[PDB]
Amino acid sequence: CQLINTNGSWHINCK
């Protein structure tokens, strides 16, 4: 799992 910030928006992606 990686914590991502896209133009301020947060999400977690897990591979």
Epitope: C1, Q2, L3, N5, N7, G8, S9, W10, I12
Partner: antibody, heavy 123, light 107 residues
Framework: EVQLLESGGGVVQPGRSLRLSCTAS????????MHWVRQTPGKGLEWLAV????????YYADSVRGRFTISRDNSKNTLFLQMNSLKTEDTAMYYC????????????????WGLGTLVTVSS | ELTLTQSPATLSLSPGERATLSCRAS??????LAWYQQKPGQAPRLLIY???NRATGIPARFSGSGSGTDFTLTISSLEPEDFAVYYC????????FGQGTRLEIKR
């Protein structure tokens, strides 16, 4: 009992460095995101940095990006904030804080905070 | 980018009364909102997250509601330990906090 204890604060002059430690106990440290948050009487609470499960996965506020560095040593259950090129307006109480870290439900919320360590930047 | 504005700045009440605290966001944050309590010389404490989800160990007299831009923390019946400073916090876009509502003793 979850516990977070910050140390390293003190008096330093503008332009100097300081490094904060945050010792964690009572939970599995490496399973949680961790943050630094500061507070001043003048402008309240300000989030500074986050480090997630992977120790190279970090984000910072604009006002400290590139001057401060968040890191964690999971074998020592310790969180750090390296504060370079300090300015008088970095004077604050610095809080260690744990992220609720529920990937399925809620995250980027601070479910436990430390006691805080005081940083005074002044000529 | 998103400012949280809290009102009133100071709320003056007595033990047993209902307390209603407001937080307004400058743009919609959906439900990504949390409330914190802080007493002098102590750290904040998490009360509510995701606007209405009561954190573990928080008494039932604390409740949160709202979505979009308008939120409220309700303390149904105040106890003396509830007199303190309260902050809302947003995580829809980066992370920001309101400036706090101070809960003080009416006399």
């Amino acid at each position: 009992e979850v516990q977070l204890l910050e140390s390293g604060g003190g008096v330093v002059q503008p332009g100097r460095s300081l490094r904060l430690s945050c010792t964690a106990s009572g939970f599995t440290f490496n399973n949680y995101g961790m943050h630094w948050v500061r507070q001043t009487p003048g402008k309240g609470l300000e989030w500074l940095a986050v480090i997630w499960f992977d120790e190279n996965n970090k984000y910072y506020a604009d006002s400290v990006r590139g001057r401060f560095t968040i890191s964690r040593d999971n074998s020592k259950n310790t969180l750090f904030l390296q504060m370079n090129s300090l300015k008088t307006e970095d004077t604050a109480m610095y809080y260690c804080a744990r992220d609720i870290s529920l990937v399925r439900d809620a995250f980027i919320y601070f479910d436990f905070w430390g006691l805080g360590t005081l940083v005074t930047v002044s000529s | 980018e998103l400012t949280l504005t809290q009102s009133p700045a100071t709320l003056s009440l007595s033990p047993g009364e209902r307390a209603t605290l407001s937080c307004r966001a400058s743009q919609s944050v959906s439900s990504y909102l949390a409330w914190y309590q802080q007493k002098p010389g102590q750290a904040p404490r998490l009360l509510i997250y995701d606007a209405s989800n009561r954190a573990t160990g928080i008494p039932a007299r604390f409740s949160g509601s709202g979505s979009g831009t308008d939120f409220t923390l309700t303390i149904s019946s105040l106890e003396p330990e509830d007199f303190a400073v309260y902050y809302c916090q947003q995580r829809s876009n980066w992370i920001t906090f309101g400036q706090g509502t101070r809960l003080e003793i009416k006399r």
